[model samples]
Target: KVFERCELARTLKRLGMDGYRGISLANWMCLAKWESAYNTRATNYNAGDRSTDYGIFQINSRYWCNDGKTPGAVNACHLSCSALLQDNIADAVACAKRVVRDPQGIRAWVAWRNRCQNRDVRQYVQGCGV
Candidate 1:
């Protein structure tokens, strides 16, 4: 499921990402845009760590979701990596919330820091009415 820009903005707002952990919905949009382009099934495998990043937010297997493949993974999100790849996005949203609860907040996502942080992200939600 590859969501259109405005569609994803409205959806993330509905999922309470508007200001979760003081991270704005626009920032979330920016994160998703750079991470996976709102594609629910997007994935990236890290050869160095032997972990896979899954879903729109690209949650990693090393410390977040359990893929049962990443060596010494912690499964901090307490869910399977497969759950992050679903079109539904409920599990992905929950895990994203949990991730921000950490001390790093949204900085936990390097994409957000590199692309979204300190940038004008309002364009992501400008016309979404979210």
Candidate 2:
């Protein structure tokens, strides 16, 4: 399921993510755009090891979700990777919040490093009227 950009922003806000764990919504929105294009069912597979990135936040199988076949999988969220691809985003948001609160902060997402980090991302929320 794909979300309208403004709707995604509103959803994030309702998730208590306006300034989630010290990271800005603009940054989070930017990260989501780059990671999954605001689609709830997005999934990307690693060609080398077959590890997968799941959902809008692209939580990885190596450390976050369990794919059952990925070696040394952590399953930190204690859920299956498939669950992240659902239309509902509650689990994704909760897992992403955990990632953000990690010592690496939002840098847990390389998309943020390449796109949103230290940049003026207020434009992401500008037209949303949130």
Candidate 3:
């Protein structure tokens, strides 16, 4: 609904399967809905730390929008990259892939989510819950 098929596909092409990983897509859609309803220019003045953050995925300009940071690198980070939130949808998707894949990235996102529901479920997603 938010992103077009071609848009999502390009992302998968660049980042391979990681670009279209399941849970990240679920969470990403959540962010997309809240960020800008997929508008790319999404901004939040009342979002606490989310104010400076903009674009389809709502990358925080306050901290997370650069390549050298948790997600995009300065070299990788570009106004063109930022612009992709609109025109080059896959680039926007690739950026999100990097965020959820960086260092303690994807796995940590799972752990963090599980804990949010209940701290006792810390490693639930890590397969220790069974």
Candidate 4:
């Protein structure tokens, strides 16, 4: 259930991602590109601890989700980590909205901090005219 880039932009806009609650859409595009390249099935594991990042947002198991493997999981979204890997993204979007409301804002995503913050990523949505 991967989305084409333009499709993702359109979907994000329709779901209020462009300016949902408070986050600008640019942040979403920038982070999604670097995080998961729009693949719903995407997953990543790093270091020896084997904590994984999942789905289009690449949400980390260390804090955001409960995988059972990660003890003391916060499960901030109150949903199973597997839920975030689905083709339907409604739950993922809702959880992201909550993360954005936290003090770190979109910086809850490490990809945003490392790549998108303070950068002009207008090209991410330029051709799609989103």
- Point to the candidate with the largest lDDT: 1
**Tens digit of per-residue lDDT, candidate 3, span 1-130:** 3554335433434445322444433344334544555666555443443234546666644444542223322433344435544644656666666565566554433423543323332221222111
- Model-by-model lDDT, in order? 0.93, 0.88, 0.46, 0.83
Model 3 CA lDDT for position 67: 24
Off by over 4 Å in 3: 1-24, 45-51, 66-81, 103-130
Error of 2 at 63 (Å): 0.4
Shift in Å, residue 75, candidate 2: 0.9
Top-scoring candidate (TM-score): 1
Q: Which window of ten consecutive residues has the lowest lDDT sum in model 2?
A: 69-78
Report the C-alpha displacement of residue 127, candidate 1, in angstroms: 0.8
Candidate ordering by lDDT (highest first): 1, 2, 4, 3
CA error at residue 49 for candidate 2, angstroms: 2.9
- Residue 20, candidate 1: Cα error in Å is 0.8
Q: Per-residue lDDT for 1-130 in model 2, tens only?
A: 9988889998898888888878888888999999999998888889787788999998999999888988777988888888899888888898898787789989999988999998888888988877
TM-score of each: 0.98, 0.94, 0.47, 0.89
Q: Model 4 residue 116 lDDT? A: 95
Per-residue alpha-carbon lDDT of candidate 1 for residues 16-65, written as tens digits (9 for 90 to 100): 88899898898999999999999999999999989999999999999999
Candidate 1 C-alpha error for residue 102, in Å: 0.2
